[PDB]
Design a protein around this ligand. Structure first.
Ligand SMILES: N[C@@H](CCCC[NH3+])C(=O)O
Ligand SMILES: O=C(O)CCC(=O)C(=O)O
Ligand SMILES: [Fe+2]
Length: 254
């Protein structure tokens, strides 16, 4: 019920000072990435366990396999299973924590700008489920500024699945220049463990997941998308919504 908004207001208050937020806002501006791991929690471990169970049920009852390349992102592959945004919104818990006014106001101190939780209907939420060798979420950008991700299940680092990122880029759907960007920039790699969360500046940080090296290395990620003020009134272009529509124009199966 309404207990989650009071639980977050107490957990954030006893775990963060205003200047620590400013330090995280500096790292966020510099790298586009702030990891909330066991050393710096953002949500209590009780809620993570509950969210993990909600995602396991949604994956078990709604996972749809994706094996395609996206033209608007230089033909990068998408090899994983998805749970559409429409099915994730069935979870009252996920909607409660992700649309919480306490969380959006706190995280606004890290982004240093207003976080509007409203995005496109088919991209509000997303669960990616990777489990096969060479499963990957290829290099891409997001249409919206922010992504709040729940690394609910992570394999060991040696199995792959780390998040790679190139901050201070931009999405040009007509000329993605994926590999050209890598030749001009350096790649940051972030290791995640089960229960980690992270905030991503997803519209200017080219990112991907390192392909899994072996079958059974289950990787389940809850992806929450939020708008910035720059995202209001956005007109979607490219016809590349592969997660909702597998037969999108810019999507070619493999
Ligand atoms: N634009 C991303 C999908 C984002 C889905 C979650 N916000 C891609 O091409 O892979
Ligand atoms: O699984 C991840 O950590 C990244 C997913 C992602 O970038 C997306 O869903 O747009
Ligand atoms: Fe993304």
């Amino acid at each position: 019920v309404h207990e989650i908004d009071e639980t977050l207001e107490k957990f954030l208050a006893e775990n963060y000072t205003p200047e620590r937020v400013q330090q995280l806002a500096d790292r966020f501006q510099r790298t586009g990435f702030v990891k909330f791991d066991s050393h710096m929690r953002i949500v209590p471990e009780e809620l993570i366990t509950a969210v993990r169970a909600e995602a396991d049920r949604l994956v078990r009852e709604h996972k749809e396999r994706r094996d395609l390349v996206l033209g608007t992102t230089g033909g990068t592959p998408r090899n994983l299973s998805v749970v559409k945004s429409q099915d994730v919104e069935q979870s009252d818990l996920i909607r409660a924590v992700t649309r919480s006014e306490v969380l959006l106001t706190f995280l606004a101190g890290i982004t240093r700008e207003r976080i509007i939780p409203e995005v496109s209907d088919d991209e509000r939420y997303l669960i990616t489920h990777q489990e096969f060798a060479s499963d990957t979420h290829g290099w891409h950008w997001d249409d919206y500024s922010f992504a709040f991700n729940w690394a609910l299940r992570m394999p060991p680092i040696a199995s792959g699945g780390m998040v790679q990122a190139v901050p201070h880029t931009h999405w040009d759907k007509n000329a993605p220049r994926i590999n050209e960007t890598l030749c001009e920039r350096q790649i940051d790699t972030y290791g995640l463990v089960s229960g980690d969360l992270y905030l991503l500046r997803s519209d200017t940080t080219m990112h991907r997941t390192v392909p899994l090296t072996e079958d059974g290395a289950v990787r389940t990620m809850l992806v929450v998308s939020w708008s910035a003020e720059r995202d209001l009134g956005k007109v979607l272009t490219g016809n590349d919504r592969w997660w909702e529509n597998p037969e999108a124009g810019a999507a070619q199966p493999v």
